[PDB]
C-alpha cells in the first residue's frame, strides 16, 4: 500500500507545495493537511490527545512536521510518531549553525552554536529526533534547508528575502535596493528542489542512512552574482545597496556553503536548479520570456 | 559582597557549595532553595526558602526580596521550562547565572581523546541533549541580552556520602564501600572503560572560581574542566595501595556500557586553565586517600 501522510502546519508555503507533490504520487485522499485541494483537519500539535486521535483514525504512516510551542509540540510529535511506528520528517535549517561553525563549507557533522532562538530550537529539534531514533525505534529523518526561494512568497521579511523580492523589480527591468551587502554569500535552493529532497529522503532505504540529519544544497550566491544572472534576461537592470545590519549580522553568522556529500553518497540527492535555472523559472512566474 | 541563591539546594552538590560559599561570604549572604522539605541540619546551617522555578513570579520574588546577584542552578518536560524562567529572571535583574553542564553532553561523533571545549555535540541521552540545550540558551542570552551566564562541564563527580544512585559514574563512588573493608566489588562497566572523573572538592571550587573570575578574561562561557580520567582496573589498582586484598569482578551492563562508550574518555580543559587559572588539587591517589578517610 502507498503511505498515508499527515502534514503540519500545512497552511504554510512548504506545506501546500508538499501536499501537491505527495497527493500526485500517493493520491488526493492519502495526504491530510492540518493547521478543497484535499483532505484537511484541524489539529493541535500542542495537544497529545488530538494528535494521537488523528494518527490512529487516518492510519498515518508518514508525518511531515512543518509547524515553548516548538518544544512541547515537537515532543508531542515525537511521542506520537514513536508509539505508532510513524516515519517522521522534521526540517532543520542553516540557522542551526553559528559563527563558531565551519562556514566554508559547513559539513553534515560540525560545531553548532547558533546565537538565535530559532537556531537553538533547531539544534534541539535535530538532537531530540536522533535521540528518539537511537533509544526508541523512531524512523526520524531531517534535512537542513538552505534559503528557500519561491515565486509565490507573498510572505515578506526574512534574511533570504532579497532573493525573492528582487525579481519584482527585474521583471519590469527596474531597480532593486538590496538589504544585504554586495558580496554576502549564502546557501540557497529553489522550493522545487527542496520539496523533492524532502520526499526523496523519506523514500530512501533505512540501512543506507549513515545519519538522520542531512545538509542539502543546490547553490550558493551573492546579491551581485544574482544580479549578474538576472541581466542575462533584463540587461538594463540595476542593483543598489542599502543594508539592514540586523539582517547582515544574522547572515554573516550563517555558513556560506553547505557540504551535502553524505546526502549525495547515501541516498543519491542531486539538485536540478542552479542559479540560471532558478533565475529563469522565477522570472517566468512573473511575465518574462526566458528564451535565449 | 555577592548575594547568592542556589536552586536544587537539597542536592549533594547544592549543600556542598552552600557550605563552601557561606564559609567564604557569610551565612546570611547565601540562600538555599528547593521545592521540598529539607533535612534538619540545613535549616539551621543558614537561610532556606521554598522556590518553585516553574512559577516565574515566585522565583522573581526571591531574587528581588533577597536582593540576589549570584545564582547557581542545580534543579536539573519540567527541566527546560524551569531553565527559561531562571534565564529570564537572571537577565531581568542582572544576576550572575551559573548552570552546570556535563560530559554526558557529548556523543560518539564527538572527539573523545581528548574532547575539546568546542566540538561536535550530539549526545544520546535525554539528559545530555537537554544540557546541550542549556549551554546554547545560556550563551544565546549572553550575546543577545546582557546575561552573564557561566557554565562548566562537570565530569563524573565523586563524593563521600553518595547513595547507590544509578549514574554511569556510580561505580566510582560505590566501590569505596567494599574496598574500605577489603571486600569484593562488582563493576557494572567493563574493565577498561575510561571516563573523566573529579573529586567533589575541586568541582565546587571550580564552580566558585569561574564565577569569581572577571568577564574580560573569558573567551567563551562554557568550559570543560578536568582532573583525571581512569578505568575501573586503574581505580582498583589505586585502591590496592591501601587495601591489597580488595577484589574486583566484572559483570558488564550493556546499557551503561553503551552510555559510557558514548561519552568522552578525557576532557581537554586548556581554555579554563589559561582563561581563569583552573587547576585541580585531587589526582587519583589523593582522591582515593581522601575518600577512604571518611569510612
DSSP 8-state symbol, A94: G
Residue B28, Cα to own-chain centre: how many angstroms?
24
Q: Which long-range contacts (CB under 8 A, 24 or more apart) does B93-96 make?
A: B93/B60, B93/B63, B93/B64, B93/B68, B94/B69, B94/B146, B94/B148, B95/B63, B95/B68, B95/B69, B95/B70, B95/B71, B95/B148, B96/B2, B96/B69, B96/B70, B96/B71, B96/B148, B96/B150, B96/B211
- The active-site residue out of B93, B127, B140, B250 is B127
Question: Least CB-CB distance to B122: which of A115, A120, A127?
Answer: A127
b/e code A135-152 from CB counts within 10 Å (16+ = b): eeebbbbbbbbbbbbbee
Distances (CA, A) of A71 to A74, A119, B81: 5, 13, 10
Q: Where are the alpha helices (DSSP H) in A207-244?
A: 223-231
- Yes or no, beta carbons of B120 and A109 under 8 Å apart: yes
Distances (CA, A) of A110 to A217, A263, B22, B196: 16, 15, 42, 23
Distance CA B266, CA B165 (A): 23
DSSP 8-state symbol, A106: B
Q: Using an 8 Å Cβ cutoff, are A10 and A42 in contact?
A: no
User: Smallest Cα–Cα separation from A141: which of A52, A204, A219?
Assistant: A204
Q: Using an 8 Å Cβ cutoff, are A279 and A232 in contact?
A: yes
Distances (CA, A) of A170 to A139, A151, A291: 44, 13, 16
Report the length, in residues, of chain A: 292
- The technique is X-ray
In Å, how far is B118's CA from the nearest CA of chain A?
Answer: 7
Angle at A151 between CA A70 and CA A190, to 5 degrees: 70
Q: Report residue B87 as a C-alpha cell.
A: 534565564
Distance CA B160, CA B47 (A): 24
Distances (CA, A) of A139 to A83, A212, B230: 11, 9, 36
Distance CA A224, CA B219 (A): 35
Please, how many CA atoms are within 13 Å of residue A19, restricted to the half-sphere of its CB? 24
CATH number at residue B247: 3.40.50.720
Give residue A278's domain range: 1-292
Domains in chain B: how many in total?
1
Please tell me if residue B78 touches chain A, with a CB cutoff of 8 Å.
no
Please tell me if residue B238 touches chain A, with a CB cutoff of 8 Å.
no
The neighbour count for residue B292, using CB atoms within 10 Å, is 15
DSSP-based three-state secondary structure for A171: helix
User: Which runs of E-coded beta strand occur in A58-133?
Assistant: 62-65, 87-89, 92-93
Question: Least CB-CB distance to A115: which of B109, B125, B140?
Answer: B140
Distance CA A124, CA A107 (A): 18
Helix, strand, coil percentages for chain A (3-state, nearest 5): 40, 15, 40
In Å, how far is A190's CA from the nearest CA of chain B?
Answer: 29
DSSP chain B: ---EEEESTTSHHHHHHHHHHHHHH-GGGEEEEESSPPPHHHHHHS-EEE--TTSHHHHHHHHHHTT--EEEE-----HHHHHHHHHHHHHHTT-EEE--EEGGG--TTS--SSB-SSS----SSHHHHHHHHHHHHHHHHHHHS--EEEEEEE-EEE-TT------GGGHHHHHHHHHTTT-EEEESS-TT--EEEEEHHHHHHHHHHHHHS-GGG-S-SEEE--SEEE-HHHHHHHHHHH-TT-EEEE---HHHHHHHHHS-S-B--HHHHHHH-------HHHHHHHHHTT-
Q: Using an 8 Å Cβ cutoff, are A55 and A64 in contact?
A: no
Q: Report residue B161 as a C-alpha cell.
A: 556520602
- Yes or no, beta carbons of B129 and A128 under 8 Å apart: yes
Please tell me if residue B63 touches chain A, with a CB cutoff of 8 Å.
no
User: Smallest Cα–Cα separation from B68: which of B43, B45, B86?
Assistant: B86
Query: Which residues have CB under 8 Å from A2's CB, separation 6+?
Result: A25, A26, A27, A30
Please tell me if residue A70 touches chain B, with a CB cutoff of 8 Å.
no
Closest residue in B to A117 (Cα–Cα): B140
User: Smallest Cα–Cα separation from B204: which of B146, B161, B154?
Assistant: B154
In Å, how far is B16's CA from the nearest CA of chain A?
Answer: 32
Chain A, chain B: beta-carbon pairs less than 8 Å apart: 52
Q: Report residue A249 as a C-alpha cell.
A: 549580522
Please tell me if residue A111 touches chain B, with a CB cutoff of 8 Å.
yes
Distances (CA, A) of A57 to A51, A60, A79, B84: 10, 8, 17, 36
Closest residue in B to A68 (Cα–Cα): B81
Considering only CB atoms, which chain A residues are within 8 Å of B271? none
Distance CA A243, CA B204 (A): 48
- Known active-site residue B127: yes
User: Smallest Cα–Cα separation from B72: which of B36, B21, B1?
Assistant: B21
Considering only CB atoms, which chain B residues are within 8 Å of A210? none
Amino acid at each position: 500500500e502507498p503511505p498515508r501522510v499527515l502534514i503540519t502546519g500545512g497552511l504554510g508555503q512548504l506545506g501546500v507545495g508538499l501536499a501537491n507533490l505527495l497527493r500526485k504520487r500517493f493520491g488526493k485522499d492519502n495526504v491530510i493537511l492540518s493547521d478543497h485541494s484535499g483532505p484537511f483537519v484541524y489539529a493541535n500539535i500542542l495537544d497529545y490527545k488530538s494528535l494521537r486521535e488523528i494518527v490512529v483514525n487516518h492510519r498515518i504512516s508518514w508525518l511531515f512536521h512543518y509547524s515553548d510551542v516548538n518544544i512541547t509540540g515537537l515532543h508531542n510529535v515525537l511521542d506520537v510518531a514513536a508509539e505508532y511506528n510513524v516515519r517522521l520528517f522534521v526540517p532543520s535549517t542553516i540557522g542551526a549553525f553559528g559563527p563558531t561553525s565551519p562556514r566554508n563549507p559547513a559539513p553534515d557533522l560540525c560545531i553548532q552554536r547558533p546565537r538565535t532562538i530559532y537556531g537553538v530550537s533547531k539544534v534541539h529539534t535535530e538532537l531530540m529526533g536522533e535521540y528518539y531514533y537511537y533509544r526508541y525505534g523512531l524512523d526520524f529523518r531531517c534535512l537542513r534547508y538552505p534559503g528557500i526561494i519561491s515565486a509565490d512568497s507573498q510572505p515578506g521579511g526574512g534574511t533570504t528575502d532579497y532573493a525573492v523580492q528582487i525579481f519584482h523589480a527585474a521583471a519590469k527591468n527596474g531597480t532593486f535596493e538590496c538589504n544585504l551587502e554586495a558580496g554576502t554569500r549564502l546557501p540557497m535552493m529553489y522550493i522545487s528542489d527542496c520539496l523533492r529532497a524532502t520526499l526523496e529522503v523519506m523514500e530512501a532505504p533505512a540501512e543506507r542512512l549513515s545519519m538522520r540529519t542531512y545538509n542539502i544544497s543546490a547553490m550558493s550566491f551573492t546579491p551581485e552574482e544574482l544580479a549578474q544572472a538576472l541581466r542575462k534576461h533584463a540587461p538594463d537592470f540595476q542593483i543598489t545597496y542599502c543594508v539592514d545590519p540586523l539582517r547582515q549580522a544574522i547572515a554573516e553568522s550563517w555558513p556560506m556553503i553547505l557540504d551535502d556529500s553524505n546526502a549525495r553518497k547515501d541516498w543519491g540527492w542531486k539538485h536540478d536548479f542552479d542559479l540560471p535555472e532558478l533565475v529563469a523559472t522565477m522570472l517566468n512566474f512573473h511575465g518574462v520570456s526566458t528564451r535565449v
